[PDB]
């Protein structure tokens, strides 16, 4: 149906997360990684009428950006997607749900083992300098009572002992220490003020980037450690 | 080597409680399948060829089967005549515990040391029989254990020749060979240690180094049958690069079988934590 | 030659030793393995660089010759070499455990060790020559013998004593050197006319149906008899100068290990059996072609026939082995099987002896025969996928030999 | 180190001449072409505490442009480069001065045969038209009685006689004639006006663009002529 510019931005972010997309009826958007390492979910103001699987989300968004914002998207008579504008009609064939990784339900996040806050500018600086400094790993840990993030180059040092770029997140008042590792090719957030919720029990452990527009969840490589 | 697993699932895997029962059932299936089917599949060829009698016939010589109640692959196929199986019964010689029949890989190839040969054969047994997490745990265990192993066995054997051609005032020259590079670094390091110089035609064990060492180079090489000098032994050991050697001596094979067995050799994604 | 050059064919055997042996005995022959002298040899040479058998520049200081009927380990040691003189070997010391300073040679071995030291090389080599003369081996083996032992001994006796004594090895005074070993053209083989050289390494490589990471004597000995030797230190080259005692004892277990393997495999009994079943000289065992020629000729002569002249053909390579295409996939339940004597069985499927050819027929694409879409190539005459055609009622001589040998194998399994 | 944006832009333009740098402890920046064909100098206000050798300049400046200008840069415990922001640090590796090619001694210009001046728009025109017109060499000469420029196409005209760009640099009150030949790629300079110091003797000659921020010196190929 009708989609707003912010809604299309969220769809483009989901396309960056995964090429395909599932659109069930409702006011929720959800898509997981092809390998399932990352998951992006959000709540949209608009509603959805019918579920549809799209293989080429980025191309569909590129087509949609060329027409009016008030165009209506529905199920065409030929089993495809029909977009009706004021003067133009577009036929985008609908992909099979089985050909694209499809999520089932959002995850009820348990109590976070750690809660932290990150700003838009700091996260943008992190992601931008990651390319320049050829950083592929980031370790979030505790150093002199401060919860911080640090950059690590996995390829040249699999021991994760070479500090290359360390950004201080905030204060951490607790003896429950941890070192959680993230791979740079996973997180794909939009700019904004975000909150980190980190949960871990034994080998089990995941992290959550929650934001004002969308919420993403990412995994931890097994060499992550934590004492609580 | 026809692969027949449909009959097992068709009959019902739940019917079998022990590996011996499954082996016996598939043996009876082979017995009931071979003689009539092979006879009919060869009598027409015999009358095509117009001979007196068809002597041509096969048997049920070898069997293989992943252990019952486990999640191991059982048998994979890396390349032509390069594979592994977990045989239970060779020519009606039943084994109480399954024996692994392996060929092609570096388990039998002497280019790699013998310790890594044992490690590869154990890993092959684990992937065939035990399952994924077993191979992951064995990987991590050996990876921990490899660092503190003696530096003699984990040093690559090379031949030191024509050293004077590739030296530039005691420093590496144009197209300096890796072993010759290590020999030059050794000569720079042992300058003033009172040790005998490396001679042309000698054999050297090479230990590569990471970038940025005080010796300023990525490898060292020391003469055959001898040890590193005690003064620089600690400085070398603290600065050796066993990472790329480990991968070349152990990781390489798993990559092939796991990619050819629907298997992973180290995991860094969840698929569990989420739905 | 004269009937060859006039363009006419001469039938029978060009080779004559086979004819003589077949005519002289005729009936099947019996033998007692005890009577034939089987000698074993091994040599250790201390050298600055790898001792090269073809040039033989270093000196021999260790020779262990195992005689079968005398059942003796003759040990020749060189005391005063150019590598510094050394002490004299002690039997009782070697028999002891290694911790007190021994080498753990089993006592029954030392009960048969006839040890002799020599101050100079010429005396030791001449003594070895006359020992060969007094007790002439009938089959002279060892582990990797034509590669390192036979050549080195003969090159050294040529370079020290001269060819007039090098030729004394053979009972008929003929030691001709063949040069080729065309595989890489690396080494040279030797042939002493009168004694049948039979390298045990080749015998194991060909008559074992086993694969090992390394075929060196130590690993295969560990595989076979589960008896390695006490680990040592340093390069072998300096062993003679460090504890020469162990050195000599080392070589003494070296020759036995081979005998042990024989006692497990009975390989020389096998070579005697094949030689006396084919009525042929011993060394022909190395060549399957000579063996098969001998047996088929003997059978045909027993059937009052004549073998044809060896036709001369050019080398035309034919397509190799049909190898299936493996999909790199894990197969949990896989039943594998291969038929018995594939090629020998086919030999009775098509009866392919030289006289059994009967012409050709219309050739279809091979896939037609694979799918069977082609019709019957012939009804009264046999068919082969090569477009050629063979008899059905006339049994070939080669199928007759196959039937005889297969029946013999079944009878002997019974 | 606390550096200004103008210094970053100047040394970015410097980075075209040479990929690496040897920032010696002091106040004076100085680079030479890798083939030793062009030298560049400048004096700044930010004092240099310690000598540092940088292999990849462009990535370093990309990192610098994505942090606060007040981030303090110094030498870490391992001899590397540590730049600390208000709440983060970056560990840029420092190369050995041996591998990074840098000029040895500060360069004076003895004397110019005919000192002239060039306006910014002149070099700007030359640089934008060089690529489009397929020009591979230029000449500074005296024609009509005035010093002028001449664009040549060595690729086709080996005689370098086919003028494509002509512009009277200025007047010429003297008896010395000259034809200095330079390649546009050889001359890389910041957009701005300059003072030309042109000298010659025998087979060897100089052109120099003195600037308000940075000064460049380019050489003249063997085809250059000078009669005094």
Backbone torsions φ then ψ of C373, nearest 5 degrees = -70, -25
| Crossing angle of helices C217-225 and C244-265, rounded to 10° | 50
The subunits that touch chain C, with at least 3 C-beta pairs less than 8 Å apart, are: B
* Phi, psi torsion values for B44, nearest 5 degrees: -70, -40
With CA atoms as reference, the chain C residue closest to B71 would be C332
Using the Cβ of A129 and the Cβ atoms of chain D, whether some distance falls under 8 Å is answered with yes
Measured CA to CA, the distance from residue B42 to residue A187 in angstroms comes to 62
Q: Give the chains touching A; criterion: ≥3 Cβ pairs < 8 Å.
A: B, D
> CA-CA distance, A141 to A174, in Å (whole number)?
12
Q: Is C323 on the interface with B (CB under 8 A)?
A: yes
Q: What angle do CA D110, D116, D120 make, to 5 degrees?
A: 115
DSSP per-residue codes, C7-37 = T----S-S-SHHHHHHHHH-S-----TTTS-
Q: Which long-range contacts (CB under 8 A, 24 or more apart) does C338-341 make?
A: C338/B58, C338/B59, C338/B61, C339/B56, C339/B57, C339/B58, C339/B59, C340/B57, C340/B58, C340/B59, C341/C406
CB contact under 8 Å between A122 and D88, yes or no, is yes
Three-state secondary-structure class, residue B65: coil
Cα D203 to Cα D180, D220, D226: the distances in Å are 11, 9, 9
- Cβ of A132 within 8 Å of Cβ of D91? The answer is no
SS3 track for B233-260: HHHHHCCECCHHHHHHHHHHHHHHHHHC
Hey, CA dihedral for C60, C61, C62, C65, is it positive or negative?
positive
- In degrees, rounded to 5, the angle at the alpha carbon of residue D131 between the alpha carbons of residues D126 and D137 is 65
Number of CB atoms found within 10 A of residue B36's CB: 9
Give the rounded distance of the alpha carbon of C349 from its chain centre. Answer: 32
Q: Is C46 exposed, middle or buried (0-12, 13-18, 19+ CB in 10 A)?
A: buried
Residue C301 tokens read as: 């002569």
C313 three-class SS:
coil
C-alpha neighbours within 13 Å on the C-beta side of residue D216: 23
**Domains defined along chain D, listed by start:** 1-228 (3.70.10.10)
Cα–Cα distance measured from residue D97 to residue D53, given in angstroms and rounded to the nearest whole number: 5
CA–CA gap between residue C116 and residue C79 (Å, rounded) = 10
Whether residue A163 and residue D92 make contact (CB cut-off 8 A), yes or no, is no
The distance in angstroms from the start CA to the end CA of chain D is 49
- Which uninterrupted H or E stretch holds A152? strand A146-152
CB atoms within 10 A of CB D12: 17
Tell me the CA distances in angstroms from A72 to A57, A93, C388, one per residue in order: 17, 16, 75
- B263-B264-B269 Cα angle (round to 5): 135
What's the token pair of residue D147?
Answer: 């010093």
Using CB atoms, pick whichever of C213, C334, C378 lies closest to residue B110: C213
How many Cα atoms occupy the beta-carbon half-sphere of C226 within 13 Å? 0
Question: How many whole angstroms separate alpha carbon C169 and alpha carbon C179?
Answer: 19
The one-character DSSP state at A132 is H
The answer to whether C194 and C171 are in contact (CB under 8 A) is: yes
Residue corresponding to tokens 């495999």? C265
Q: Is the dihedral of CA D159, D163, D169, D170 positive or negative?
A: positive
Count CB atoms within 10 A of the CB of residue D81.
Answer: 21
CA angle D161, D166, D169 (to 5 degrees): 120
Q: Could you tell me how many residues make up chain C?
A: 414
For residue D227, the tally of other CB atoms under 10 A from its CB is: 9
Give CB contacts under 8 A, 24+ apart, made by A7-12. A7/A44, A7/A45, A7/A46, A8/A61, A8/A64, A8/A65, A9/A190, A9/A213, A10/A42, A10/A44, A10/A190, A10/A213, A10/A214, A11/A57, A11/A61, A12/A57, A12/A58, A12/A61
The 3-state DSSP class for residue B85 equals strand
Burial classification of residue C50, based on how many CB atoms lie within 10 Å of its CB (0-12 exposed, 13-18 middle, 19 or more buried): exposed
CA distance from start to end of chain A: 48
Would you say B204 and B198 are in contact if contact means Cβ atoms under 8 Å apart?
A: yes
Helices (H) and strands (E) in chain C, counts: 16, 11
Which of B132, B198, B193, B124 minimizes the C-alpha distance to B163?
B198
Check residue C336 and report its DSSP letter. Answer: B
Resolution of the experimental model, in Å, one decimal: 3.7
Q: At what angle do helices A120-132 and D57-64 cross, to 10 degrees?
A: 180
Q: Can you say how many angstroms the Cα of residue B145 is from the centroid of all Cα atoms in its chain?
A: 17
Tokens 């442009």 sit on residue: D65
A125/B152 Cα distance (integer angstroms): 46
Give A116→chain D minimum CA distance, Å.
Answer: 15
Q: How was this structure determined?
A: cryo-EM
Give the closest residue to C284 by CA, choosing from C11, C17, C31, C12.
Answer: C17
Q: Do B64 and C340 touch (CB under 8 A)?
A: no
In angstroms, the CA C344 to CA C348 distance is: 7
Enumerate residues 6+ apart whose C-beta is below 8 A from A198: A112, A113, A114, A115, A116, A140, A178, A180, A205, A206, A207, A208
Q: Considering only the beta carbons, identify the residue of B3, B7, B57 that sits closest to C339.
A: B57
**Three-class SS of residue C195?**
coil
How do beta strands D52-54 and D21-23 pair? antiparallel
Phi then psi for C310, rounded to 5 degrees?
Answer: -65, 105
Is A18 in a helix, a strand, or coil?
coil
User: CA dist C301 to B259, C16, C18, C304, Å?
Assistant: 61, 14, 12, 5
Count of beta carbons in the 10 Å neighbourhood of residue B275: 14
Taking alpha carbons only, the member of B161, B201, B206 closest to residue B186 is B206
Angle at C21 between CA C17 and CA C22, to 5 degrees: 115
The answer to whether residues C349 and B49 touch, using CB atoms and an 8 Å cutoff, is yes
Looking from the CA of B24 toward its CB, the CA atoms found within 13 Å total 8
Buried b (16+ CB within 10 A) or exposed e, C228-263: ebeeeeeeebebbeebbbbbbbbbbbbbbbbbebbe
Cite the beta strand spans of B160-241 per DSSP E.
167-168, 171-172, 203-208, 219-223
Q: Go through chain D and tell me how many residues it has.
A: 228
Contact D61, D8 (CB under 8 A): yes
Structure tokens given for D191: 């957009």
Q: Give the whole-angstrom CA distance, residue A18 versus residue A25.
A: 20
Give the C-alpha separation, A68 to A86, whole Å.
Answer: 8
Asked whether the beta carbons of C142 and C258 are under 8 A apart, the reply is: yes
Phi, psi of B264 (to 5 degrees): -120, 140
Interface contact D88-A168, CB threshold 8 A: yes
Cβ contact (<8 Å) for A220 and B269? no
C-alpha neighbours within 13 Å on the C-beta side of residue C237:
8
Rounded to 5 degrees, φ, ψ at B178 are -60, -50
> What does the alpha-carbon distance between residue C93 and residue C88 come to, in Å, rounded to a whole number?
11
C369 in Cβ contact with C385 (< 8 Å): yes
């Amino acid at each position: 149906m009708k989609l707003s510019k912010d809604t299309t931005a969220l769809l483009k972010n989901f396309a960056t997360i995964n090429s395909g997309i599932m659109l069930k009826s409702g006011q929720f958007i959800m898509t997981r990684a092809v390998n399932g390492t990352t998951y992006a979910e959000a709540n949209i103001s608009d509603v959805i009428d019918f579920d549809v699987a799209i293989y080429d989300l980025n191309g569909f968004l590129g087509i949609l950006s060329l027409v009016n914002d008030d165009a209506e998207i529905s199920q065409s008579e030929d089993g495809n997607i029909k977009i009706a504008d004021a003067r133009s009609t577009i036929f985008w064939p609908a992909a099979d749900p089985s050909t694209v990784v499809a999520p089932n339900k959002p995850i009820p996040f348990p109590v976070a083992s750690a809660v932290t806050e990150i700003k838009a500018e700091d996260l943008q600086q992190l992601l931008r300098v990651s390319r320049g400094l050829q950083i592929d790993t980031i370790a979030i840990t505790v150093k002199e009572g401060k919860i911080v993030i640090n950059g690590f180059n996995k390829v040249e040092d699999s021991a994760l002992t070479r500090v290359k770029y360390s950004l201080t997140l905030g204060d951490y008042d607790g003896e429950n220490t941890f070192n959680f590792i993230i791979n740079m090719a996973n997180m794909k957030m939009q700019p904004g003020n975000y909150k980190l919720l980190l949960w871990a029990k034994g080998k089990q452990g995941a992290a959550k980037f929650e934001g004002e527009h969308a919420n993403y969840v990412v995994a931890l490589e097994a060499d992550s450690t934590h004492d609580f | 080597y026809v692969c027949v697993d449909k009959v097992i699932e068709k009959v019902g895997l739940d019917r079998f409680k022990e590996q011996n029962d499954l082996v016996e059932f598939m043996n009876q299936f082979g017995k009931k399948k071979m003689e009539p089917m092979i006879d009919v599949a060869y009598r027409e060829l015999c009358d095509y060829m117009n001979n007196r009698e068809h002597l041509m016939h096969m048997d049920r010589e070898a069997i293989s089967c992943p252990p019952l109640g486990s999640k191991g692959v059982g048998g994979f196929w890396k390349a032509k005549k390069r594979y592994a199986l977990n045989v239970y019964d060779m020519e009606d010689k039943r084994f109480a515990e399954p024996h692994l029949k392996i060929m092609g890989m570096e388990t039998q190839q002497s280019s790699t040391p013998k310790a890594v040969q044992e490690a590869l054969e154990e890993s092959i047994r684990r992937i065939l029989q035990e399952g994924e997490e077993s191979v992951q745990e064995y990987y991590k265990n050996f990876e921990k254990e490899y660092r503190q192993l003696d530096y003699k066995v984990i040093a690559e054997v090379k031949t030191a020749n024509d050293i004077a051609k590739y030296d530039d005032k005691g420093w590496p020259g144009f197209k300096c060979p890796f072993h010759i590079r290590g020999v030059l670094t050794y000569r720079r390091a042992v300058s003033g240690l009172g040790v005998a110089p490396i001679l042309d035609g000698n054999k050297v064990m090479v230990l590569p180094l990471r970038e940025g060492n005080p010796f300023g180079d990525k490898c060292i090489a020391w003469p055959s049958g001898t040890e590193l000098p005690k003064e620089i032994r600690s400085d070398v050991l603290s600065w050796i690069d066993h990472s790329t050697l480990f991968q070349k001596s152990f990781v390489k094979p798993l990559a092939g079988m796991c990619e050819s067995a629907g298997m992973d050799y180290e995991e860094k994604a969840s698929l569990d934590f989420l739905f | 030659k004269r009937m060859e050059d006039i363009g006419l064919e001469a039938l029978g055997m060009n080779d004559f030793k086979l004819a003589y042996i077949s005519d002289t005995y005729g009936s099947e022959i019996v033998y007692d393995r005890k009577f034939v002298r089987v000698a074993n040899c091994d040599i250790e040479v201390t050298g600055d660089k790898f001792p090269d058998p073809m040039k033989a520049e270093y000196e021999i200081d260790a020779i262990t010759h195992y005689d079968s009927i005398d059942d003796r380990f003759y040990v020749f040691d060189l005391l005063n070499s150019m590598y510094g003189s050394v002490s004299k070997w002690d039997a009782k010391l070697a028999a002891k455990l290694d911790c007190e300073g021994g080498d753990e040679v089993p006592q029954e071995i030392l009960d048969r060790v006839i040890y002799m030291p020599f101050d100079n090389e010429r005396d030791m080599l001449m003594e070895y020559i006359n020992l060969w003369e007094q007790k002439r081996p009938a089959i002279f083996t060892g582990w990797n013998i034509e590669g390192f032992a036979v050549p080195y001994i003969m090159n050294r006796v040529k370079m020290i004593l001269g060819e007039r004594s090098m030729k004394r090895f053979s009972p008929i005074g003929r030691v001709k050197s063949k040069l080729i070993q065309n595989m890489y053209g690396s080494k040279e083989i030797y042939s002493i006319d009168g004694v049948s050289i039979l390298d045990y390494l080749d015998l194991y490589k060909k008559f074992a149906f086993t694969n090992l990471p390394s075929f060196s004597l130590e690993s295969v000995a560990q595989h076979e008899t589960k008896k390695g030797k006490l680990p040592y230190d340093g390069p072998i080259n300096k062993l003679r100068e460090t504890n020469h005692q162990r050195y000599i004892s080392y070589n003494i277990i070296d020759v036995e290990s081979v005998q042990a393997i024989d006692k497990i495999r009975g390989f020389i009994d096998l070579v005697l059996s094949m030689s006396y079943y084919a009525k042929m000289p011993f060394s022909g065992v190395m060549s399957p072609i000579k063996t098969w020629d001998a047996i088929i000729f003997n059978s045909l002569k027993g059937e009052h026939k004549v073998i044809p002249q060896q036709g001369s053909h050019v080398k035309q390579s034919f397509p190799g082995a049909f190898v299936f295409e493996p999909k790199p996939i894990a197969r949990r339940y896989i039943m594998s099987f291969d038929l018995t004597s594939l090629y020998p069985s086919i030999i009775r499927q098509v009866n392919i002896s030289p006289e059994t050819i009967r012409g050709q027929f219309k050739v279809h694409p091979i896939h037609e025969y694979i799918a069977g879409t082609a019709p019957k190539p012939s009804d009264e005459y046999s068919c082969s996928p090569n477009g050629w055609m063979y008899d059905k009622h006339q049994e070939g001589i080669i199928p007759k030999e196959i039937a005889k040998v297969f029946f013999q194998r079944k009878d002997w399994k019974k």
